[PDB]
Structure formats: C-alpha cells, structure tokens
Amino acid sequence: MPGKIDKILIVGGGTAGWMAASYLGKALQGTADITLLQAPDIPTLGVGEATIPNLQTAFFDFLGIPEDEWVRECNASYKVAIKFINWRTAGEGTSEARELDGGPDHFYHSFGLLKYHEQIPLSHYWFDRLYRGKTVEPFDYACYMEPVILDANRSPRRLDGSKVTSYAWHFDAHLVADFLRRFATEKLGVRHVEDRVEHVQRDANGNIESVRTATGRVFDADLFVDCSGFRGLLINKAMEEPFLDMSDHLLNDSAVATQVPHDDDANGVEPFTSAIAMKSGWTWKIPMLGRFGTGYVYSSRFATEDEAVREFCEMWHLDPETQPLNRIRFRVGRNRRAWVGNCVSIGTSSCFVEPLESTGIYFVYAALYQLVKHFPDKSLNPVLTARFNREIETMFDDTRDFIQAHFYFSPRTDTPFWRANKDLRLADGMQEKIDMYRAGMAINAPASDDAQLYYGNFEEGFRNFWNNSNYYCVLAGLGLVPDAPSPRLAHMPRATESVDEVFGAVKDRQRNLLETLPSLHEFLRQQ
Amino acid sequence: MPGKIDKILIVGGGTAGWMAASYLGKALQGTADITLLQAPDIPTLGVGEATIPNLQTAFFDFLGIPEDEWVRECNASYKVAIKFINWRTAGEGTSEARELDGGPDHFYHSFGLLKYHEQIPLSHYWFDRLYRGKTVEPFDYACYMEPVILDANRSPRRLDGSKVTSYAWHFDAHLVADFLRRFATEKLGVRHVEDRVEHVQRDANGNIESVRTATGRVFDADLFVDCSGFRGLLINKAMEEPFLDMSDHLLNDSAVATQVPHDDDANGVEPFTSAIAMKSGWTWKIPMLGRFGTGYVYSSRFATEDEAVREFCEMWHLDPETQPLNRIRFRVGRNRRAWVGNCVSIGTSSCFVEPLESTGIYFVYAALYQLVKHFPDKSLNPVLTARFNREIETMFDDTRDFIQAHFYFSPRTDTPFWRANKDLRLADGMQEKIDMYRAGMAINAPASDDAQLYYGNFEEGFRNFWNNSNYYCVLAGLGLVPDAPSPRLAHMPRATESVDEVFGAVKDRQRNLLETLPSLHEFLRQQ
C-alpha cells in the first residue's frame, strides 16, 4: 500500500488561502501536517463579497461552525437576490432605476427554484400566457414571491428566527478570512508562517521539491496548494502552466472599488446585491452593517482608469481626490489545468470571472470539495488529477458562458461597450443552451423543485449548478423569450387551466409576507 | 403561433408499438388523434422479459395503472437481481454453477443503491478491508442484503404486501403487449387498424407525408412513430437513416430461445433473472408462473445456428428435434439518429443490445419520456430533435459500454469466444470509467442512497442510469478491483472504524430477513 499524503504547504494567505486551510485542516485532521505561508501586503479596502446559500452547507457546516456564530463574528448581512438595475435602458451610470414601460427598470435573480406544475417549470406557463396576451407581468414578479418583499427591504428571517426563503450573505471578505485564520491555526493546528516566497525548486519530473523563503527557510511537502491569487507563483510561475485568457467572451478586466458609510436607521438594509449597469461595465453594491461595498467593473478597452474613477465617483457622489479607492486589473479566465504534478490551484490563482453572479467564494469551496473528492496518495494517480481538472473547467466555463449572456442579451446600444458585447460569440455550448430556450425548453432543469435538497446536497448543487430558474431570471429578465410557448402545454389543457392556482399562491404569499416580515434592518439589530 | 401535432401514426404493434400508443395516448390525451398500424406476423414463443424497478414508476404509474392490476393480468413474477452463473470459470454450457474458491461460481447484481458512509460508497470500504486482508467476503455478500435471501428464493414482499427491497418483474412480453392494446384502444381512444405497410410517401423536406397500406388506404399524420422493430420500415427504409453496427464492441448477434414447463410447487420460483455463461455467449433464465423463459444469446462469429441449438438444448435436457424453438438473428446497434424529420423511433427500430442487463423495455419507456419531454409543434424545431437524439444516443452507448465490460473483464479464456472478447477495444468513455474505478473512485455515484427517490423520480434514475453500485456489482463480481484503496480512507480513521457497524447491519438484515421472509412461491400462490 502506497504512502498517504503526509505534509501539505499552502502558499498564499488570502481568503482562498485560509479557506483551503480550514477545509483541508478539518478534512485531514490528525493525518496531515498543514503549514500556510503568506507574506506582508498592502491590504485592500473591504469592498465586499456576495455569496450563494450553499456557503453554509458545503463549507461552514463541513467545518462545524454554526451559521449564527460566523455571521455574528464577521458582521454579515443577508442576501436574497441580485437586483439588476438599468440593463435595459440607455444612459449614464446612475444608482437610480430608470423608467421602462411604466415601472422602474430592474429585475431580480433570486435564490431558490421555480415551482414545478405537472412536471413542467412555472416559467413555461408564465411565458405561455405572456405570449398569448393573458398576462403582462414580468417573469420575476409572476413566478417568485421574493421580488415583492425585497422591494420593501423585508428580512429573509422572521423575528423569531424562522426562514421564509433561500438566502446567502454579504460580508467584508477580510473579516471572514481573519475568522478562518484564527479557526485553522487555533482549533485545527495549521502552522502559520509569515514569509515571502523567494525561490521554488523543482525535481526531475517537474514537480515541486521545496519552496524557499526570503529569510532562507526551506519548506517541503507532498502536495502544494497555490493560493497566491492572480500571481500564480506556484501553478503558473514555477510549474510553467499557461493561463488561458478568456476575453473573447468577457470584455471586463478592471475594477475601481471602495467602501461607503451608510445610514441603516434611515434607509434600512437592502436584502439583495445590486448589479448596476454603467456605460463601460456594471457596478456592484453589497450592503453590510452601516457600510456597503461598491465597485465599478469596467472594460479597460472602453474606458480609461480615469474615466472609470469619475463615472464611479459621480454616481455615488464621492470625491475622486479624497475617497480611498482600490484600482484593480483582473486576470479574466483560467489555468489550462488547475492541477499539475503536486501543485493544486485554489482561488484566483486557478480561475477568475467578474462577480456578476457571486461566484468568487463558491469557486474556492467547490474546488476544495472537488480536491478532497479526488484526493491522491503519494503516487499521484493521473486519473485523479485529470478528472479533478475536468470538473474545475466545466465549473469555470459554464459560468463564463452564463455571465457573458448577461451582456450579450442586453438590449442597450448606447455606448461602444454595449454594442461591442453583441459582436462577441457565445461558446458553442452556451449557444446550444439558447437554442433550447427559444424552443421553449427548460435548461438544466432541477431534478427536484425542493430548494433545500438543492443547496443542501452539494453534489446536487454542483452537477446542476446553473439550472432553469437562473436562466429564465436573467434571460427573460433581459427580455429574451422563446420563439413560441413550450409545445407540451398545448397538449396539457388540464394543466394550463389549473396553473393560475399556483400563480395565485405566489400572489398570496407576496401579499402576506409583505405585511408579516420585519425589515432586514430590524432583524440585524436583534443579531 | 404555429400548429400543434394533431395526428400521430404509429407503425408497429409490438410491445414497443403498444407502449408508445399507451404513453402518447395518455400524455397528449384529448389533444391528438393517435392511430396504430399493426399487421399479423409469424407468432413466437413466450421466452420472457426481464425488467427494472422504474417500469412501474416511469411507465405504469404514468398510465395510472396500479402494480397489482397489470401484474395479475399478465401473470408476472418478481425480480430482485440478476444472478451471474459461471462467468469466472471454464467449462461447457451448464445450468449448474461450478466451483470457485470453495463456493458456487455466481455473483449478484441487485437493485438497491449502495449505502453511503460519510458521503463515501460502502464499496470503497469493502475494498479497503479486502486489500488489507481484513476481509475475504465477495462484494455482493458484504455490501448488499439481497444475496442471502435470493439464495433461499424468498419473496421481496412479505405476505402482508409489505416490501423489503427494490424489485422488478418477469413476464411474457405478449401478455403485457395485449393488456396495453386493450388499455390504449379501449380507455384512451387509440385507433387500432390491421394493415400492412406498402408505400411511404415523403415530401421535399424529406419528411413523411403519408403511409399507404396494402389495402390501398393512406394514413397521414403530423408525426410518425416507427415501432416496426428490426425492419425499421420508416426510419431506416423510408428516411434512409443509416444503422450503426456495434460489433466492434458487441459480439453477440444470434439467439435460440424457448419456454419451459416448471413445477412451482415442487421446486419453487427463483426471485431473480439468471445470466448463465456459455461457451459462445450466455443463456438467460426468466422465471414465470409454472413456466420459465430461456434463451441462449450467442455470437454467429463463433457458433453456428446448429451448434447453438445443440448446446442450448443439451443444457436444459430438451430434444433439438421436437422442442419448439425460436431462432433469432438480432440487429445489434443503433441508428445514427433516433429521430429524423417528423419520424421518431421507439423500440428495436431505434436500437437493440442483448438482454444481459434487462434494458429492452426500459429503452422503450425511456425514449417515450424523452419524446414527450422534447415534443414538437408543426414547426419541428431542430433543437428538440437533436437534444432527443442526444439522450437516446448516450443512453444506448453507455449501456453498450457496460454490457461489453461483462465480457471483457471475465477471467475466462477457455473458448475462442472468451479469448476474442479480450481482443476487442473498449470505447474511450468506458476506458475512462475503468481508469477511474482502478483509481479508487466511484463511477457515476448517485446523489442520494435513497433507492425509492432514485427509482421514483425518473429524471434522476435516467441521468444517473448506470451508477457506482451497478459498476461495482459487475466489475467486482468478475474480479476486477482497484489498484489500491481510495486515498481518502487513510485520512478518515473514524469512518473506517465505524463501517464495522454498517457491514454489521447487512448481516443482521440478511439473517433476520432469511428467517422471517416467505418464499416467492408462497407469496405468488397467495396472489
């Protein structure tokens, strides 16, 4: 029997750095010696992270950390949707929803899954009626309860603590990474070393022998986890593994972000991340406690850093000359392979796409999950590495495609940027998915419509990650709809007649919860 | 909005024909006029069909026909597993299991899902112990209850109806096909027309316009369902869609079968299908009431029709000169596309593999589920056709790959046949599964271990058709095991401690069910 993996080195102590340590530390407790190694750096401003409900179940639960413990520690707010503002109307970068067809220009992509009615998703019925002029209501307000209580800043949890929807979290990623550093080093015995990588020594098979620091210390391991971010000091720099840039699908590659103090007592707290459309990109808003993180993700090919700073500053009425700002140049795309030899890449050293669908932290634990699932012994079975790499690239490429579709099907033509997004090509696979949608099909419909079984079983919320609910939210929201209704509904007349009962169940639940839910401000006050 | 499908013509009245008619009859009820076109064929003996548990949940439940109703009507027996006799030992075509390491040469592929212990399949734990000399028990007896009661022919239902395992059915195909012809024609207004197909008329879009029968009538429809079996009267002969002969993976093409009188009161009924290895193929045994179907599937490349008749007849002690026998030349493979134009194929006209893993009927109701799901309007969107052909294509090729692995990984080398199966190449997709399997990994492990949820939600039980449990039963059974244990197990000392009480559970459940269960004969008698 071959040697198990004894000693692990994680280069990088960012957010992915410490998540890899917590997760690996608890998954190999007592059977592996983990040492993390991270260097002194200029900290960035806490500009915020938006997340996805399985952060609790796939990650914190695995560690053994109760949701209320880490939420209280890192002062996190609650997230129920992403509110997409101004993607359908022309004009300047404003925090104000423009006017489109009577009401404001927004749509909600909310957590949870559409209700099935006689083995067909609610979306199909909605569109059937929309197409035959029996409704004019937007997909989101017809099929989801969420858009109504969200308009009113209601809490996802009642005052007593009961949960009325699927939600995720907003937080300063720094504070969470600090939480996980304390946990990993204190309760899981991960060894923290503060030092700078100086030289990496490779053996004859091109694997990592040892990494040596600036103070002359040498560390050696069985498995090296590269969590160094965009630098890819192990996977790219030492291992010479190519990073596949992917700006043939994503135009954005830069950001300018800050943190803005906010009066919660006066305006309450928003139970959603806001994706606000600009002239050469979009802008995030991530509500926190008395704070909100915000960042303008732009394309450097359509706006200079100067233009992006004053566009971003004007919309928030901030002083360009005195507001602390971070200016980032992103590495958009992924490694050709995430794992080569004894080097495994976790976090932005592996891949990266703009945070339009809150996939930042997801990629890290989804990958850490995948790494444990496909875990090696000292023989480093190539089958294990191959399949691991395959899950990581379909995970990444799928999301790259989904996010591109946010720009591709925007009606806007008002700036060179919005018109430029229309000249791009969708991947062959995203292209096949639109054809399906126009044919009146569901795309990757969930196995079940049970919101809990989906976020709860991570093996299920991975294989089927971007499901039919999400595609309709974003595509029907942008205003792209099927050529004609789902051919099946013309053959299911019991079902189309009996559907307005379910359309009325969401209407009843919107109305009851609108007047039976504390403001998210009130709920947070209690916590 | 474009026209719905008003009229469908099904050509063919076999099991596939009447399943198609009953399915579509109930799915598009009130909204389509369905007509079936069967003409008399030379009748065959009732040599038996083995099934899979979702025949009740995906098909009959959908029709609204309760289990006890059709099982009583068609005098069906119960199936709990496929017992594999003499696949690992050299010798003539006998009905008796030879010796192999101090026990009969047989192993079971049962219906359950393998239990999860710390989101790792029990198979990984059993092999762990095997490798470290802690155990020596075969995979099927270690990890499933099923073999210990199947060894004693007990019933999967207690006398009070209560069910203690997943089970499917054995039955004469003829009686089920006639039960459904009554049900379709009587309770779903399907038009049965007795006539032979003389001429198929196509338009310039290559679609079928009408079929003209020998009595001189023409039938036209928007959609044509080809249920004509191997002849492929529409899909292959009219539409000229080519057939893919799969004989670089599947050597078996011929078969000689009969029905045998059985004294149930004297010997009892076997609660399983038997797959008995012969010199140039294998012989099925399908127990029924007072009867058993039996057929020697063989490769005409290695056995002449006469040699197959002699071998088969000697095996069962029958007279090659007086015993009613069916001699069949199979069409093995699938069409290049299952659905071309307005012409859809169902049953053996679409694809056929030997009945080693009981997929004949499954393929029919699988394709119908997929046809209803991807159902068209008169515009006949191509995406629906392609996505359908895609599912039918992977459903077949997967099953083909799995069937081939039964012969590939047998240890036998005694006959030209067995040696030759080892010179065949595995498909690339199969090789990858085998690579994984040897790397300790599971192959297609099911989201849950809940066998009811699996055999219940057909979309789950289809997406994850051949799962890890299937692969382990067949591969471990033949004696193919991984190169070394799952590497995760070494980092899970607490898990490998506590599986003791899980293997301990199968042993109690085996012993407790063996002494408290009635025989399948005692139960069938009561029903």
Swiss-Prot record, chains A, B:
Annotated phenotype, changing residue 79 to M: Complete loss of halogenase activity
Residue positions binding chloride: 359-360
Active site annotation, chain numbering: 79
Residues where L-tryptophan binds: 357, 454-455, 461, 465
GO molecular function: monooxygenase activity; nucleotide binding
Enzyme class: oxidoreductase
UniProt site (Important for activity): 357
Cross-referenced InterPro entries: FAD/NAD-bd_sf, Flavin-dep_Halogenase_NPB, Flavin_halogenase, Trp_halogen
Family to which this protein belongs: Belongs to the flavin-dependent halogenase family. Bacterial tryptophan halogenase subfamily.
Matching PANTHER family: FAD-BINDING PROTEIN, FLAVIN-DEPENDENT TRYPTOPHAN HALOGENASE
The protein's name: Tryptophan 7-halogenase RebH
